[PDB]
Structures are given as C-alpha cells and as structure tokens.
Amino acid sequence: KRISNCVADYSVLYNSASFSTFKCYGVSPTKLNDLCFTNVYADSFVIRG
Amino acid sequence: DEVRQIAPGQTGKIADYNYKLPDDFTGCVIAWNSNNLDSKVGGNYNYLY
C-alpha cells in the first residue's frame, strides 16, 4: 500500500507494546516524527515466527 | 521481554521512564528467571513500572 499526502504520527505506533518485533534499519523510531519522506510503502504479510 | 532494553544504547518506555543505561557502559549484566520465587497465580502485582 502506498502512503502519501498525509501526516504520520509514528510515536503511537512505537508506544504500542503489542508489537513483538520492531526494527528500523536506516532511521530511528524516535526521529521518525521529525523526518519527512517522499512516499511510504507499507507491505504486509503473515510469516512463520 | 525488557531484558533487551537493558543493554546500553537501547530505547523504550523502560529506557525512557524508569531505568536507563549509559552509552559507554562498562560492566556486567546478570539475569535469571524468578517466576517460581516471585510469581503467584492471582498475579504478583507487587512489581510496577
């Protein structure tokens, strides 16, 4: 799914403890709120653990 | 699960509200399960964060 033309508040996503794994490889989650992007690609799927 | 937030350079609600290590930490971390020692079926709510 292509996300564009909006404001993303990743702080709530990070603050949700329901996520077992969260890893950002080119950025830090804290800095995300202060960093603007061109466009985002949310790719979803279900995998084995 | 928080046993990973303990290591230096980490971040999270534990690392941002209650207990935070330094980036240059020099020392040794030791951890062992104490479920049988300090857990009850009804919920040992004596441990807060």
Swiss-Prot record, chain A:
Effect after changing residue 21 to A: In strain: Omicron/BA.2, Omicron/BA.2.12.1, Omicron/BA.4, Omicron/BA.5, Omicron/BQ.1.1, Omicron/XBB.1.5, Omicron/EG.5.1
Effect of residue 13 to I: In strain: Omicron/XBB.1.5, Omicron/EG.5.1
Region named Integrin-binding motif: 48-49
Oligomer status and interactors: Binds to host ACE2. RBD also interacts with the N-linked glycan on 'Asn-90' of ACE2. Cleavage of S generates a polybasic C-terminal sequence on S1 that binds to host Neuropilin-1 (NRP1) and Neuropilin-2 (NRP2) receptors. Interacts with host integrin alpha-5/beta-1 (ITGA5:ITGB1) and with ACE2 in complex with integrin alpha-5/beta-1 (ITGA5:ITGB1). May interact via cytoplasmic c-terminus with M protein. May interact (via N-terminus) with host bilirubin and biliverdin, thereby preventing antibody binding to the SARS-CoV-2 spike NTD via an allosteric mechanism.
Protein role: Attaches the virion to the cell membrane by interacting with host receptor, initiating the infection. The major receptor is host ACE2. When S2/S2' has been cleaved, binding to the receptor triggers direct fusion at the cell membrane. When S2/S2' has not been cleaved, binding to the receptor results in internalization of the virus by endocytosis using host TFRC and GRM2 and leading to fusion of the virion membrane with the host endosomal membrane. Alternatively, may use NRP1/NRP2 and integrin as entry receptors.
Full protein name: Spike protein S1
Organism listed in the record: Severe acute respiratory syndrome coronavirus 2 (2019-nCoV)
Gene (UniProt): S
